[PDB]
Design a protein around this nucleic acid. Structure first.
Ligand code: MG
Ligand code: MG
Ligand code: MG
Ligand code: MG
Ligand code: MG
Ligand code: MG
Ligand code: MG
Ligand code: MG
Lengths: 99, 92, 63, 96
RNA sequence: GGGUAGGUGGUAAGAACCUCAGAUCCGGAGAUUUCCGAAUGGAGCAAUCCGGUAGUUGGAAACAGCUAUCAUUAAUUGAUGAAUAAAUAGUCAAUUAAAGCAAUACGUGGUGAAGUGAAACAUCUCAGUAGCCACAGGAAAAGAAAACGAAUGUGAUUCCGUGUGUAGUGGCGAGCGAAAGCGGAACAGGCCAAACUUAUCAUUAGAUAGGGGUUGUAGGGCUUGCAAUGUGGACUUGAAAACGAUAGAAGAAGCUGUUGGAAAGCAGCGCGCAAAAGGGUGAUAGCCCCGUAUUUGAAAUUGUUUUCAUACCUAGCGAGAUCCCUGAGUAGCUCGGAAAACGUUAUUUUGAGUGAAUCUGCCCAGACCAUUGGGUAAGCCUAAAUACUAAUUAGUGACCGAUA
RNA sequence: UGAGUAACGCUUGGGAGUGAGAAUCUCCCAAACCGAUUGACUAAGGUUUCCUGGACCAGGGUCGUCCUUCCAGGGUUAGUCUGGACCUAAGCUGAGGCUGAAAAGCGUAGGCGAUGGACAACAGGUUAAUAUUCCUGUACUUACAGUUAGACUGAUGGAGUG
RNA sequence: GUUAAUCUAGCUGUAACCAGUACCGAGAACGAACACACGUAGUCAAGGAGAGGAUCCUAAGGUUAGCGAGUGAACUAUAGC
């Protein structure tokens, strides 16, 4: 199951595969932190997967790094800054009225 | 941006007590060498919510298993709590 | 180092065999004198040189 | 190869049980154990009839192609022209 | 590549999977190889902190990701440049080496005690031992005669036995103790400086690179001829072959009875052998298993040797003549010391001073001179025998068997 | 053995509860000492001793349902606080360099080195355990761009202040 | 520096890193071999009489000095007379 990875786009598709594996490995470990991970065997495999892929991008002269070359979030942040406007405006008005 | 700096979340009674409020302070354990800038950038690129404030503490190792013929030492970990704006909440 | 710079002839260690032949360790220091020298690039230099090599310098006309 | 492989019939040469023909399930090659089904059932008293391992010395393969279903040694030297290493009984010629 | 059928390291069962499209395992070769540490960007309370420079990505920009580089010293090369005009010191840049560790061992070299013995003690011994320190190395050091030393003589060094506990040396007390000669292990001797000649350096060369030449029954150079095409290695590159080292494959022969928890014992009748070394198997097994004897086999990496070609080095017998050369602050001599068996003495070394000669020469044969005889310093290099084993593999023990 | 001997290292009485078992544990009520302290805050140190639940081999000079012991789980949240990222003293190190058989020693430029200098946050609340750190309310600072207006800035160096 | 850099005052926006932060701080968590009568920098320091941080008693708050129960001989220490 390595010669089936040499044949892939050993320059560029492997980078996308690497980032996908890192993401799903992270989500695996997070699932392991709580409960609901019923196949604890997937971690050891997926790490084992990356070990081969990097081994290719290291036999070839390349690197996993530098191959790279908010639905309600923005609304919530806008509300935050608007509240900051209100507080700052209220504070400035009280200071200028006092003088 | 390897996002190897989000090792694990911790679920304790204190975390739930602080989380059910309005600020929704999540918590994570991060690389012992990581810093708040890397933590908040990693959070940005792992979930999608730019975090408001980040706090870090570290639990220094102590003696573990006490007297059991093979006494040992605990684990050095940096816990970072992550705050979020009022009307937002995400899960792991 | 109290040895010269042209060669490296250093002190000689011997005994202070007094009368009645009591031994006492003692040092012999080379005679060091600050006579000059001229190299074949200019750069006239002042070097701590021993007298035995000073004579050799004097006969080979190295000044 | 290995004189004893999971699956093949096997009988006991020495011990409290004689001619205890049965099937082998697990083999621990590191510690030289075999787990023959139907033999040495020790009544575990858990605070059950799980088997008890029998050392490979006691075990002996079971000829089944000869009229006399007797017990014999094994050769490996037979490498058939159209095959890999195989087991053949010394006092016979019966593969496996 | 080997190799099969299980496996996910031990306290370890269970849970969840991988596997007989050939996993784990074993051997070779690779890649990854956080941080400190010679530690080397700058620091520092070791394993932490603070950065610069050049790229690229994100960002409006600080700023953050992601890469590489950033110590000192020595040599060489280039650039720059002072008091001072030129020049040198210095400064900047580039490239190449080490700095450290350990095998508590072995080697060399520097420095160097005391306890003790002397029935005290200072000369002396312990002792050039321990220790401190520098420096490598797979071995080192030493080394190819200005020798031994008493003769129709040996012919580099090293190491073992003997000479012998001798000749000698020692407050002639304690004590110390060779060099010859002889029997042996191993055996190789090569190369510069200088005469002369060549080319070039404001050729003031007294310098740079060549040729040539290497020494003692003296040799070489200088003038002139003959014979030579070859051994030889202290040795460069290739090719081929052999024998090994690193995983492994095959690898003969047994049943019955009694005590018996279990027999492999004991007993009956057999059997096999280039295997009756060893370990396990319910008690002591040649035939139950795993091996052993034997016969075998390597893709890859590595070792020793051999063969063929391949460079560099290397070859011999004569004739002429006051020609020239044959290692200078050197050998000696003197003052203080020491290595050598010798407590200072021929020989050997040296901190201070002085200081020659040039084959009709110089030194040597225990102060010294003559005669006779031996050898040619003052320049370099050198395998082998030798010392040691923390290490890898196989194995042994009239060695220990948990106060050892 | 000495010996079940000396010692047990500054302090009480009770009710109710628990529990198989209580002088010894939990609660209550008194009582008795402390009060320039046995009180409250912290530095130095120590290194989980902190909080909750459980246990009673050993440690506790007795006992124990209990312990600062043991086991499982948990807790430490900073632009402004103590210190770095600023500064220097004594002093330490120290390129080149000086001296020294050897190692090392001395020392210049640089660099480190607080016990000191300079630097901006207050009050209250909250959890079993944190709090100028979290939360609520009100603040200040130092950088960065983009923008409006005014103005010529004025240092690795000199001076004053510190 | 002008064919504008840099600073000053204001407005909008962005960022504010690294370690410490628990608990003890001593007649039981530190240095004394201990749950040992000893030692250890600084800070807050109530009321009555009083010159006062002395002295006697109390407050805020905090402890039960981790062996007891008796008897009240010789004898010992400590106080009183
Ligand atoms: Mg003589
Ligand atoms: Mg008594
Ligand atoms: Mg008594
Ligand atoms: Mg008593
Ligand atoms: Mg005290
Ligand atoms: Mg105090
Ligand atoms: Mg008072
Ligand atoms: Mg008082």
């Amino acid at each position: 199951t390595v010669a089936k990875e040499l044949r892939q786009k050993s320059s560029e598709e492997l980078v996308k595969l690497v980032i996908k594996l890192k993401g799903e490995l992270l989500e695996y470990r997070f699932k392991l932190a709580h409960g609901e991970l019923d196949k604890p065997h997937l971690i050891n495999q997926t790490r084992r997967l990356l070990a081969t892929i990097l081994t290719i991008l290291t036999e070839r002269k390349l690197n996993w790094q530098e191959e790279q070359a908010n639905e309600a979030a923005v609304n919530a942040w806008k509300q935050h800054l608007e509240a900051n406007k209100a507080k700052l405006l209220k504070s400035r008005a009280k200071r200028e009225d006092a003088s | 941006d390897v996002t190897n700096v989000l090792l694990k979340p911790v679920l304790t009674e204190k975390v739930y007590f602080n989380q059910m409020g309005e600020t929704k302070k999540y918590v994570f354990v991060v690389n012992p060498k990581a810093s708040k800038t890397r933590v908040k950038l990693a959070f940005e690129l792992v979930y999608g919510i730019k975090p408001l404030k980040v706090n870090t503490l570290i639990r220094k190792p102590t003696t573990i298993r006490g007297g059991s013929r093979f006494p040992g030492l605990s684990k050095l970990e940096k816990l970072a709590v992550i705050t979020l704006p009022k009307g937002i909440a995400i899960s792991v | 180092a109290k040895k010269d710079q042209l060669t490296l002839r250093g002190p000689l260690y011997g005994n202070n065999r007094s009368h009645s032949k009591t031994i006492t360790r003692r040092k012999w220091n080379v005679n060091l004198q600050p006579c000059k020298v001229k190299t074949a690039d200019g750069k006239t230099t002042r070097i701590l040189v021993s007298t035995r090599t000073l004579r050799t310098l004097k006969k080979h006309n190295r000044l | 190869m290995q004189r004893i492989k999971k699956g093949d019939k096997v009988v006991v040469i020495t011990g409290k049980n004689k001619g205890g023909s049965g099937i082998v399930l697990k083999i621990m090659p590191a510690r030289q154990q075999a787990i023959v089904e139907g033999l040495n059932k020790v009544t575990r008293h858990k605070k059950v009839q799980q088997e008890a391992p029998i050392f490979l010395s006691k075990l002996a393969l079971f000829d089944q192609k000869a009229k006399q279903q007797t017990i014999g040694k094994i050769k490996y030297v037979m490498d058939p022209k159209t095959n890999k290493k195989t087991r053949v009984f010394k006092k016979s010629n019966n593969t496996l």
